[PDB]
Amino acid sequence: NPLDKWNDIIFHASKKLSKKELERLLELLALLETFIEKEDLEEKFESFAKALRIDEELQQKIESRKTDIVIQSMANILSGGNPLDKWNDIIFHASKKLSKKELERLLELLALLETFIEKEDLEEKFESFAKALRIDEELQQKIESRKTDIVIQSMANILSG
Numbered sequence: 001n002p003l004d005k006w007n008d009i010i011f012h013a014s015k016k017l018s019k020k021e022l023e024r025l026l027e028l029l030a031l032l033e034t035f036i037e038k039e040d041l042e043e044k045f046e047s048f049a050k051a052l053r054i055d056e057e058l059q060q061k062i063e064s065r066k067t068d069i070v071i072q073s074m075a076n077i078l079s080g081g082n083p084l085d086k087w088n089d090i091i092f093h094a095s096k097k098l099s100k101k102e103l104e105r106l107l108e109l110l111a112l113l114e115t116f117i118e119k120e121d122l123e124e125k126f127e128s129f130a131k132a133l134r135i136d137e138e139l140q141q142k143i144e145s146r147k148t149d150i151v152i153q154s155m156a157n158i159l160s161g
Contacts (some may be wrong), residue, residue, distance in 0.1 A: 001069075002066070002067045002070050003104055003107070005068065005074070005097070006070040006073060006074065007069070007100050007103065007104075008108075009073075009074050009077060010022070010073075010077075010103065011092075011096075013077045015092070017077050017080070017157045018077065018092075019088050020076075021073055021076050021077055022088065022091065022103075023084055023088075023109060024076070025069075025073070025106065026082075026084070026106075026122055026147055026150055027109075027111065027143070027147065028110060029106065029110055030109075030115040030143045030144075030146040030147045030150060031130065031133075031143060031152055032110070032126075033113065033146055033150075034139070034142055034143055034146055035122075035125075035129050036113070036116075037118075038129065039112075039122065039125065039129075041116075041120070041122075043079075044120075045112075045113070048080055048112075048116050048119070049112050052112070058115075061115060062108065062111045062112060062115060064113055065111040065114060066108065069107060069110060069111060070107070079125065082108070083147070083148045083151050084147065084151065084154075086151070087151040087154060087155065090154075090155055090158060091154075092101070094158045095158075095161065097161075098157075098158045098161040099124065099158065101161070102157050102158055106150075106154070113146050124128050129132070142161075
């Protein structure tokens with residue numbers, strides 16, 4: 001139901017509002033993933049993410065963070081380049097079953113990354129990473145590059161379906 005309602009709100013809001021919201025979530029994903037690499041936690045995140053297949057305590061903690069993300073997302077819509085433009089075209093014109101599975105996949109990953117950060121107590125380190133982000137044009141290019149990578153994977157998953 002929470003994910004079902006988020007999908008309804010995403011596909012029924014004005015094209016402008018849903019594009020800004022999906023782009024916000026993508027940037028957050030690119031930011032979190034880059035932080036994991038900059039902090040060299042790639043393998044430690046994978047051994048954390050793998051446990052979701054066989055842990056009851058984790059499954060509930062993720063299902064709960066996904067509902068919170070969905071609530072923030074829905075709240076944002078009510079409040080008012082080429083790779084990202086193409087990804088938006090694809091997401092909105094794809095088989096509605098394929099775009100829903102894909103958007104849910106990105107939501108799960110986001111819920112996983114944020115839960116990992118907190119468990120690992122990297123909340124402050126992550127803030128102080130986004131605090132030195134503005135003055136870092138190099139790191140800004142790294143994020144833009146990771147977003148295009150996320151977009152390619154995303155387009156590949158829809159095509160794979």
